[PDB]
Symmetry: C3
C-alpha cells in the first residue's frame, strides 16, 4: 500500500476541502440508468461473467482519476497508488451476504483470474469479511432484485469516509436498449459533480467500446 | 385495547449476527430506494370494486410488513425484538390549513376488516389538526402520501438513526407510460435489520400482490 | 436583510416544527424529470442563456412561499423578506467550481443584468465563495454531465439547515419531450411534502407559461 500526499495549501480545492471537511460536510448519491446494450453483448460474446466484468470497468475508472482514491492517513490527505474493489457476494442458504476484495490490474483477463480465484476460495465462507479488509478499497454492491430508479445510502458517520460506493441494480429492456440502474455515493470533500460526471461519461463510453479482453 | 406481543431475538443464533453488530455501530447506515411500481392491474381492480386507493394500498404494504420479521424489529427495554404484528401509520392531509397528520390503524389480514377500521379512524380523526391525533404506538411502520409528484426519487435522511428500524414507504403520483400505469414508490430501511435481499424480495412481492389482488 | 419573526404559538405547524427540530429531525430529497420542452423552445427563440432563466424561475418560487425562506437567527425562527439564489459557476481550466450569489429581482431582465455582472466580475475567481456567503440564500447546482434519475444530498449536520438546495442534471430527449432532472433537498422542520410538490407543480406551470420576458 503506497500513497502520496496532497499538498492542500497549493490545491485549487483547498477551500472546498476545508468546507466539506467541517461544516458543510456531506456525501451525495446519484443514480443513472446506464445503457449496457453493447456491454452486455461483449460479455455474452466472450462468455464473461457480468459482475466481475462490470466491477472491472468500475475499478479501472477508480484507478484512472485520483479523486476516487483519497483517504486520511495519520492526519494527512493522501492518495492511494491503487484501489482494489470490494464487492458483495450473496449466500442463498442463509440468505446473507459477504464483502470480498480482489487485487486490481489494468488487464481484465488478469483481474478476472484473481476474481474467480477469490470467489472460489471464499464464496462459501459466511464471515461478513472472509478475507479481511484493506485501507484502499472502493465498494460495489449488487442489488439484482430491483430495477430502481434511485438507490441512496445514508451513512451515520461520514468523517473521512472517502471510499466511493457503487450499487448496481437489475437491468431491464427498454425498446432496443438494455439499461442498468447504477448509483454512486461519494463524499463531497474529495469529489465534485465534475468528477462523478467525468467518471460516469467515461463509464458509458468504456462500456460501449470495450471489446472483451 | 390491543397490547401486542413479541419475541426476543436470540442474537447468538442469528445468521446475521455479524451484520447486525456492524450496522449498529460503525457501518451504521440507513438506505433508500425508489421503484416505479406498475399498478395497472391493481388500479383496474380498485376502480371496479369501489375502493379508496390509499387504504387498499396501505393494506397491501401492511400484509408485507406482517409476512417478514425483518420489518418488525425494535429495541425494546434494551433488546432486539420481533413484534407479532405491526400497524400502519399513514399520512392524512388537511386542505384548509395545508398541514398534515399521521394516523395509525390496527392491521388485519382481511381487507374488509381493515377497511372498516381505517374508515372509522379517518372519520373520527381526519380533521383533527394534532400531528398524531391518536398518539403513537410502539410498533408501527410508516406510509407517506406524496400525491403531487411523479418522483423518480424520493428519500429520507433521518438524523438520528439508532434503532430506527421501522420501515418508511413514500408513495408518489401515478401516471401513464404507454399501456401501463406506474406509481413511484420509495422505501427506507435501516441496514442493521434489512439487507438488499429483504427489501428486494419485499418489492418483488409487492408487484405480485398488486397484480393478483382480487379486491377483498 | 429584513425578516419576519414567526409567532410559533399561532403557527399551524407548531407541533411539526417542534418534532422536526428535535428527534425525528430529517431532511429529504426528491427528483423529478421536469418537462422543459416548452421552456427550452422559449429560451431559444429568444435572447436566452438557459441557466439564468432557470435560476430566475426557481428564485420566483422561493420568493412566493415563506416556507422556502426560513432560518434560525439568534435563537428564533425567522422568515427572510427575500432569498437570493446562490448558483454554481464551473472553471474549465482548474476543473473546480465556485458558488456565486445574485440579488433576486422580480423582473427577469433586471435579474439577468445582475447575474451577468456577477458572472463577469467573479466567474474567473477561484475562491469557493468569491463574494462570500450572505445569510439568506438558496442553492442551485448545475450538474450538466449526467441525466440522473436521482440526486440526493446527505448533509452530516442538519441543524437549522433550512435553505432549499436544487440540483439540475442534463436534459435529454424522450419521445416528443425534452426532460430535465431536477432534485430538491429541504428540511422537514420547514417543508412538508405539500410545499415541495406545490412548488414543483408551479415550477412546471411557469416553465410551460414562461413568455421570455
Amino acid at each position: 500500500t503506497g500513497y502520496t500526499t496532497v499538498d492542500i495549501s497549493q490545491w485549487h480545492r483547498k477551500e472546498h476541502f476545508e468546507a466539506f471537511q467541517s461544516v458543510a460536510q456531506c456525501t451525495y448519491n446519484q443514480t443513472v440508468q446506464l445503457d449496457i446494450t453493447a456491454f452486455l453483448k461483449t460479455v455474452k460474446k466472450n462468455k464473461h461473467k457480468f459482475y466481475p466484468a462490470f466491477i472491472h470497468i468500475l475499478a479501472r475508472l477508480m484507478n484512472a482519476h485520483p479523486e476516487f482514491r483519497m483517504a486520511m492517513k495519520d492526519g494527512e490527505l493522501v492518495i492511494w497508488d491503487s484501489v482494489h474493489p470490494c464487492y458483495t457476494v450473496f449466500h442463498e442458504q442463509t440468505e446473507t451476504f459477504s464483502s470480498l476484495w480482489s487485487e486490481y490490474h489494468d488487464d481484465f483477463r488478469q483481474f478476472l483470474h484473481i476474481y474467480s480465484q477469490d470467489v472460489a476460495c471464499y464464496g462459501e465462507n459466511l464471515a461478513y469479511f472472509p478475507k479481511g479488509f484493506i485501507e484502499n478499497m472502493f465498494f460495489v454492491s449488487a442489488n439484482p432484485w430491483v430495477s430502481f430508479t434511485s438507490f441512496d445510502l445514508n451513512v451515520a458517520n461520514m468523517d473521512n469516509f472517502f471510499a466511493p460506493v457503487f450499487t448496481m441494480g437489475k437491468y431491464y429492456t427498454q425498446g432496443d436498449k438494455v439499461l442498468m440502474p447504477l448509483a454512486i455515493q461519494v463524499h463531497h470533500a474529495v469529489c465534485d459533480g465534475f468528477h462523478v460526471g467525468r467518471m460516469l461519461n467515461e463509464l458509458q463510453q468504456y462500456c460501449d467500446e470495450w471489446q472483451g479482453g
